[PDB]
Amino acid sequence: MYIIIAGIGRVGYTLAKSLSEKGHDIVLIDIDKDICKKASAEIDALVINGDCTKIKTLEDAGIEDADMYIAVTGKEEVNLMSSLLAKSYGINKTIARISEIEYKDVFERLGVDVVVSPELIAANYIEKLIER
């Protein structure tokens, strides 16, 4: 019924802020206590302090009632493991970020719905501009 975002960093925070304002029900997960404080004070969404690879953390995030799980942590193994765990919990759309461009197609096959490579994206973006 809602969306969970793991990794409230440069990618996560911005996405959360933007989604929170667009009128979406979001829940944020971050292993850093101080980051959860900031986010909870600056964003209208529920915040959970903990490791998103842990089942209990996901349960606390309401993993069972989400139709979307986005893992944008700075560690692709956390995003990978997180996403696959979420998938096995019924969630229909999972989005995982990678730091290894060469993992995009690998993560997809393994089951991740959408694999985001900020680097690869930034590149195409720059290329599209030159092509205009």
Ligand X SMILES: NC(=O)c1ccc[n+]([C@@H]2O[C@H](COP(=O)([O-])OP(=O)(O)OC[C@H]3O[C@@H](n4cnc5c(N)ncnc54)[C@H](O)[C@@H]3O)[C@@H](O)[C@H]2O)c1
Instruction: List residues forming the annotated binding site.
Output: 7-11, 30, 51, 73-74, 97
What count of other Cβ atoms lies within 10 Å of the Cβ of residue 56?
10
Q: Is 113 helix (H, G, I), strand (E, B) or coil?
A: coil
Please select the residue that binds ligand X; options are 37, 64, 74, 126, rule is CB under 6 A: 74
Q: Which stretch binds ligand X (CB under 6 A): 16-24, 46-54, 58-66, 107-115?
A: 46-54
The full length of the chain comes to 132
Please select the residue that binds a copy of itself; options are 48, 70, 86, 91, rule is CB under 8 A: 70
CB neighbour list of residue 44: distance below 8 Å, 6 or more residues apart: 20
Q: How far apart are CA 87 and CA 92, in angstroms?
A: 7
Which of ligand X, a copy of itself, none does residue 59 bind to, with CB < 5 to 8 Å depending on kind? none
- Check: CB of residue 107 under 8 Å from CB of residue 96: yes
Annotated binding residues for NAD(+), as ranges? 7-11, 30, 51, 73-74, 97
Chain residues binding ligand X by CB under 6 A are: 6-12, 29-32, 35, 51-53, 72-75, 78, 99-100, 119
